[PDB]
RNA sequence: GGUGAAAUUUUAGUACCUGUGAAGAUGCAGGUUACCCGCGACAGGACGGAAAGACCCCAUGGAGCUUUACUGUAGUUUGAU
RNA sequence: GCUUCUAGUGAGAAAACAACUGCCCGUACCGUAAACCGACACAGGUAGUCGAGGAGAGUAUCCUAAGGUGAGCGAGCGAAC
RNA sequence: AGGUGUAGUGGUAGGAGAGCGUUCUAAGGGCGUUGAAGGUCGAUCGUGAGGACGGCUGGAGCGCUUAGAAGUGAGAAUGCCGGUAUGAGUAGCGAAAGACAGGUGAGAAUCCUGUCCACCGUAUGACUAAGGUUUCCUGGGGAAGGCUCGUCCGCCCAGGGUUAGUCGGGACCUAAGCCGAGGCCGAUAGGCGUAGGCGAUGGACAACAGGUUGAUAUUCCUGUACCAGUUGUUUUUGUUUG
RNA sequence: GGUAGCGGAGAAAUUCCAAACGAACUUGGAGAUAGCUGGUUCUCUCCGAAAUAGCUUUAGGGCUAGCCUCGGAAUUGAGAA
RNA sequence: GGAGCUGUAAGUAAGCUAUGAUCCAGAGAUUUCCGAAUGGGGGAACCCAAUAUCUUUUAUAGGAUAUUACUUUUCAGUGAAUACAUAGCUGAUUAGAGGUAGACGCAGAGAACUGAAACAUCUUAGUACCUGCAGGAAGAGAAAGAAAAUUCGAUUCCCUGAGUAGCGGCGAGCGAAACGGGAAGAGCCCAAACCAACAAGCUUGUUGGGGUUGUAGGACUCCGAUAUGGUAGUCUGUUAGUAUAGUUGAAGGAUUUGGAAAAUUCCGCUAAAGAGGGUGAAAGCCCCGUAGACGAAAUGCUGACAACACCUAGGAGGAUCCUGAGUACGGCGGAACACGAGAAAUUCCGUCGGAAUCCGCGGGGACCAUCCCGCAAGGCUAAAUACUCCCUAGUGACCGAUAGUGAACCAGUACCGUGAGGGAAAGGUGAAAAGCACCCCGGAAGGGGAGUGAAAUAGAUCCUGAAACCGUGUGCCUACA
């Protein structure tokens, strides 16, 4: 996938848009990513999970890949990226300004 | 199979015919006869057709 | 009290007599009788159900059988080669 | 299989005792059945063995022994048929 | 474009004409989360097939115009498939004895225990071949299955259970029959058949009694045996007129 | 264990050959053929029959003619009363 | 290839990965047992051996690996009746043995219903079925041809000829061919004469040479050139391309509505890319892509180039020799030819008889003469043609779950049948599980709240949710019909 564990990425589409997080897990298989404090939902779960009350957990579910735009980290806005050979070493370069990754 | 040893001859169908041309299935097989041939230098009995033997060029020890 | 089918079934608020009519009508005509809903019984009718009558006839249908029907033919036999 | 006979084969044989070796498959359970064949936990069908006592010819019959069973809807009522 | 006048306008088989609606294609022009199709309701419009417009439901697509192409229109085929009725709360619930006490449990005529009663007993007992193939045991369960019920079950869930030199089968034997090297025969395919095999329902063949587990036992264990063979020890006698 | 459908087997009944045997079962030829029965789906408008003759291995089928419909041509108007 | 991964399938558990995992493509290793099966047996997936070597135990028992079917080809060795032999026998060697793609090809064998408005000729058909053999194609093919415009110059296939000529209980029906136009094109080797060598009993075999045909050719005898051209040869390399993984690849933000924007409005931009798919509704500019550019360690496949191999002589002479025999052809009986025995040529099968041979032989639809055209009884041969179980990329005024494959789903399954064989039903929560914590009635099932959600009358029998059918409420009516 084009964004990947850790980058700094900004939501572009969904309920949680012009957020800001980093990628907590990536699932290529699925097109999806987890991002920190984005998507979040109140999940009712059965004491069964070492929990002992149960109550209602809150976690980020995925969202889908195309809704998040990486961060620019020298310059803190989203861009598309690009694939520059810097090095011999395949990175991803910003479109918007030509910084790495 | 029951075949002439030299020339091949075999049983095939032919057709019965009446009068009225009515038409039955019928074999027609070649005059076979067991020879004692003088096969590849050993004689052994085979079937060989009379047209086969007609020219006296085959064995007949 | 529990459990729970089936054949059948165009819709049915589904009487009697005489008559009528595809000539034997719960349903048409005329008249007569009959408050509404059931339960246990009986089978006269619904030409009741079941089976596209087996009898009968028909189809230039089928099948099995017979023979001095026709035409063939396995087999058998006789001659030529 | 076994027992004999020589032909062949033979350098070793046998006895006693001691120690030791001996593979694969089946081996549950039902089986006059609710567990098999009958579409069913179906009044049918299913080879062979054992199959007790009294009376008795008897494995008949009636009641019983060892043993097994009360059987997969019941409670009333005590009409017709 | 229409108007007037006269006349005509029942209809099966069937001929002719002109249209309605369905899906798709093309172009154009449009409508849709401010709610498409579909569903449902309404007292709406047209000469007919049929067409709108609203409310509700619904949640993504779909009209309109012109032309094109069609798996294009259903009420009947004892039509096919599905669903659901009617008969009905009706027939039936499959050959027979049960009763009560106590227990278990949310719940018991139906499960457990007890007592008496009753039934089979050349059997409804005890074995075993086949067949079945886990139905066996133990602990749980009560959706479905069980013709009622169910706390129970040959059901469901989770674990477990089948131990042999001697039993039965193979490493033994052959019968019927089958297969069949070469072989014989035959359009092909193949058919038959000798040697040689396969093949029990028969022949041959070494252990028994008791005990033991929830479930296996002539299989495990105890005691006491037997059959084939192996290694070693001692004892005898034979080494090629052996 | 043997005999298999143009067959087998039959103390013989058209008897049996996997719950229908004058000839099993299955698949295929195959959408066999069916002058027979049944079924064949929207609308309106115009017109509208026949159930006869002849021939027919023809008689509940068919063919030509007659009768219906649509289009067209043309004449000293040939039709009807 | 570059950050996650340990399949569907979660869950826990335990791990792997920048020393490059998972994943992707090429090439290898492993590959139990059954199955042609093949050491022997057998009721497939089991059982039981021999021989050799190794191993286990003191040893027997036990274990491992290898070899051992049948027939064929060739060689060797043994070796019967039986003298030499031969057969048999043992070993080695060599090659088949089965399956498919339910297709296409050739061949053997070969129906019936059906049509003829009955039915035996005929038709259905040389079809279905069975069997053999194949090959990627097969078959056919290099004139004993087509013709008679005068000529054409192997075969195959397409158009046409033509529903013509014909065949036909002259019924029903069956039904050409050549010419003409196209696709594609390609030609070659033997036998014999003769020569040489060898072996054998002057010929009589083996080998090599020679030779290949119809305006006749060749042998042979003369001279004369050892050139020039060609190829339907080979795991001969080299090279390029190509298939089988990949890399790169432009351009949008706000605003309104909404749970969510891609819808809307506003201004922008990119385009060799406005194919298509995905993304919380309908996106050229968010993602995967697309146009375009680019990429190969390995293994195939193809094309060249090179190598090597294999073919390739002109002219004049006829004295003699050769040019496919039990063949051609004929009688008889069948069959194939569109052609049903017919006036029936041409081709073939069975049976019997049976030629000529260059002054020859065959055909020109009975037959003869003449003329013309060809040269059988030997073989091979690419392309144009047929088909698609599979593989890759796509297409559709094709289907959209009663359709479309029987099968969108764990289907040739469940289920039925002794067996061959027959053969189903069954897709959809939501954008995301966020799949309803907790409470309450209940043994549970199931409900009621509380929550999640845009919506749960979207709660898993989950989108929509028609009708039959079943029920609850009640505006009006109903117990003399
Ligand atoms: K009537
Ligand atoms: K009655
Ligand atoms: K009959
Ligand atoms: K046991
Ligand atoms: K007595
Ligand atoms: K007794
Ligand atoms: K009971
Ligand atoms: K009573
Ligand atoms: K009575
Ligand atoms: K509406
Ligand atoms: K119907
Ligand atoms: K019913
Ligand atoms: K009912
Ligand atoms: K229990
Ligand atoms: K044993
Ligand atoms: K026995
Ligand atoms: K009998
Ligand atoms: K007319
Ligand atoms: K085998
Ligand atoms: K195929
Ligand atoms: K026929
Ligand atoms: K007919
Ligand atoms: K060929
Ligand atoms: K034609
Ligand atoms: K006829
Ligand atoms: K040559
Ligand atoms: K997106
Ligand atoms: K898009
Ligand atoms: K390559
Ligand atoms: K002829
Ligand atoms: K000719
Ligand atoms: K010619
Ligand atoms: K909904
Ligand atoms: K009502
Ligand atoms: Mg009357
Ligand atoms: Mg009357
Ligand atoms: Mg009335
Ligand atoms: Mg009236
Ligand atoms: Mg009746
Ligand atoms: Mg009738
Ligand atoms: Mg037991
Ligand atoms: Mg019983
Ligand atoms: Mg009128
Ligand atoms: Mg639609
Ligand atoms: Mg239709
Ligand atoms: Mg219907
Ligand atoms: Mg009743
Ligand atoms: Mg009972
Ligand atoms: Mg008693
Ligand atoms: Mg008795
Ligand atoms: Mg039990
Ligand atoms: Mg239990
Ligand atoms: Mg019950
Ligand atoms: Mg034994
Ligand atoms: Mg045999
Ligand atoms: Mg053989
Ligand atoms: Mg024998
Ligand atoms: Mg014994
Ligand atoms: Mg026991
Ligand atoms: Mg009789
Ligand atoms: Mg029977
Ligand atoms: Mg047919
Ligand atoms: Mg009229
Ligand atoms: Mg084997
Ligand atoms: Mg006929
Ligand atoms: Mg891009
Ligand atoms: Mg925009
Ligand atoms: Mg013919
Ligand atoms: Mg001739
Ligand atoms: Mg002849
Ligand atoms: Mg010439
Ligand atoms: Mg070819
Ligand atoms: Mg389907
Ligand atoms: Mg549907
Ligand atoms: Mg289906
Ligand atoms: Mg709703
Ligand atoms: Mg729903
Ligand atoms: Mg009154
Ligand atoms: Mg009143």
Redesign the pocket.
């Known amino acids: 996938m084009?964004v990947?564990?850790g980058d700094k990425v900004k939501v572009?589409?969904?309920?949680?848009?012009?957020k800001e997080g980093v990628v907590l897990?990536?699932?290529?298989?699925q097109?999806k990513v987890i991002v920190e404090g984005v998507?979040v939902?109140?999940?009712?779960?059965?004491?069964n999970?070492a929990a002992p009350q149960?109550?209602?957990l809150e976690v980020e579910?995925?969202?889908?890949?195309?809704?998040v735009?990486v961060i620019d980290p020298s310059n803190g806005e989203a861009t598309?990226?690009?694939?520059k050979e810097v090095d011999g070493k395949?990175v991803r370069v910003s479109?918007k300004t030509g910084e790495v990754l | 199979?029951?075949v002439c040893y030299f020339t091949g001859?075999?049983?095939?169908?032919?057709?019965?015919?009446?009068?009225?041309?009515?038409?039955?299935?019928?074999t027609?097989?070649?005059?076979l006869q067991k020879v004692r041939v003088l096969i590849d230098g050993?004689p052994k009995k085979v079937w060989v057709?009379?047209?086969a033997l007609?020219?006296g060029?085959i064995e007949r020890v």
């Open positions: 084009f990947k564990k572009i589409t969904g309920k949680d848009k012009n897990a990536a699932f290529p298989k097109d998507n939902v109140k999940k009712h779960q059965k004491p999970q149960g109550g209602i579910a995925p969202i889908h890949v195309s809704n735009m598309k990226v690009a694939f395949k479109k | 199979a029951k001859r075999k049983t095939s169908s032919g057709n019965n015919r009446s009068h009225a041309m009515n038409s039955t299935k019928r027609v097989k070649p005059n050993k057709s009379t047209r007609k020219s060029k």
